[PDB]
């Protein structure tokens, strides 16, 4: 079929993505040798379909070929994976991925003129190396996403190579491609992390909630059928099985498209498009309009006297149906808010169905939902007002202080990333009509990044408790945490807190990132201080920086005018 053709056609690209994600230390020369092995396997299976290995799991084939490369498992420290076979080997390979890609060099940027020359002379080589470099730095991003990203990156290179000011074009036009990649990455890590911590049974409520919001005219049975396809799709994609991921993604899009009528109205130009665009499209299409005849409630869950019986006959399906009906009627709610509501409903019924008069007790379920949602909504409203008052940077500094207090054991680079990701929820969403849904959806992804994808991280006991107990209530849990008062920092050199003359300028993100790192390191150093004292000290340093840039020889200015943060005898290090 078309999917098998797409895979056969793109086998070189597919192989690079898989190899680079699994073995992020592997060199580009090493990639080329695996490419030749998989092309050959592809040709062999075409010559002889009934041969044994031609019906094996795709990952089992790829991992066999990687493990067969002389000295490679030992060179990149994955010999322990190759000493296992089949499922145990697949699991080991999955555990081998590293979220922290700081062991890699800075992304190798080509000279714009040579990049353009390379694009015209050797296009396959350029895209091959791009895809290698992207995949090893984004080990959990799903293949259809990465291939779409490569396509868009190619359109950027093609268009910008025709312009006079090539550098400005490349830098500008790359921004939304990067944002796409980072948005999908965050979302995929969130779902995969949840799958590993809690299993498919808790997690497929996520897909019921999202699909029911997006396709509110769908029938329950068809939704459940689609949810089964989606859950399988996440199983393979979360594993890292690139071939199975592509196949299962194509199945989901075909399932959706082959019932366009009786699912959706707003996906026609998507059901035209190519693999894998037709599906990155469907994912980006907006929510279909609710059936005009859909009221705000379903009295079948609060007004019927059959609730406890329906629940008892099949609790999983009963709660799936609740999630379907409630989600499709509340397009304004976030996914985490819907899952909190499902849990509250489940807890409510545990109590009510064992009381003297259950119908009199569960009749008031919507009052419980109303209170919990009002609390969430008020919190978002407060955070959005704070954003309006302080701007992006000002709010970010408050988050950096709070996050560093609560999770000081994280690297500064990580804390800085988490702070930027947190503030982006507010810059993207505040003031929109679905502000609540947008903010809570995007904010929740931060704690998904924090809690880990293929590891149960051990940060500190309070953070670990929030990561591992209760997906839907994870953000509220994090909001309740106090500073970790057991923390004692390592020494920090005085140079971490020294402003250098080269930093005086107008810049986008590297100068932003330097300021952000300063604040985080300061908070680690002075963790004992109150948030207000830290904010005050930081604004002192900020004021001094601003003046000294407007001074000529800015660095002598900084050292005479900056506040001191050392204990009396400290010159080289601060403790
Ligand atoms: C991370 O934590 C999760 C949840 O505790 C672990 O997943 C469980 O692992 C046990 C034993 O391997 C299985 O019997 C359970 O079925 C798993 N539960 C779920 C919900 O998936 C996971 O193994 C941990 N990661 C490790 C130990 O590396
Ligand atoms: C990787 O394996 C080598 C060879 O046994 C070992 O010396 C080294 O310590 C290992 N490195 C890591 C990071 O595990
Ligand atoms: C809660 O109920 C009140 C009164 O009916 C209503 O005004 C409000 O919109 C509801 N809030 C939520 C979050 O549903
Ligand atoms: Cl990733
Ligand atoms: Na590095």
Numbering used by the authors: 12 to 586
Provide the publication's sentences verbatim.
Here, we describe how the controlled dehydration of afamin crystals was able to stabilize a new orthorhombic crystal form, increasing the resolution, inducing a change in symmetry and increasing the number of intermolecular contacts, and leading to a more complete model. The use of a humidity-control device has allowed the orthorhombic crystal form to be stabilized. The transformation involves a contraction in the a cell edge of over 10 Å and of the β angle by ∼3°. The number of crystal contacts between symmetry-related molecules of <4 Å increases from 1999 to 2752 and the buried surface area increases from 968 to 1128 Å2. The result is a significant stabilization of the molecule that can be seen in the B factors. The possibility of forcing PEG molecules into binding sites as surrogate probes by dehydration is intriguing. In the example of afamin, the presence of the secondary binding channel occupied by a PEG molecule opens up the speculation that afamin could, at least from a structural point of view, also accommodate moieties with two fatty-acid chains, such as phosphatidylcholines.
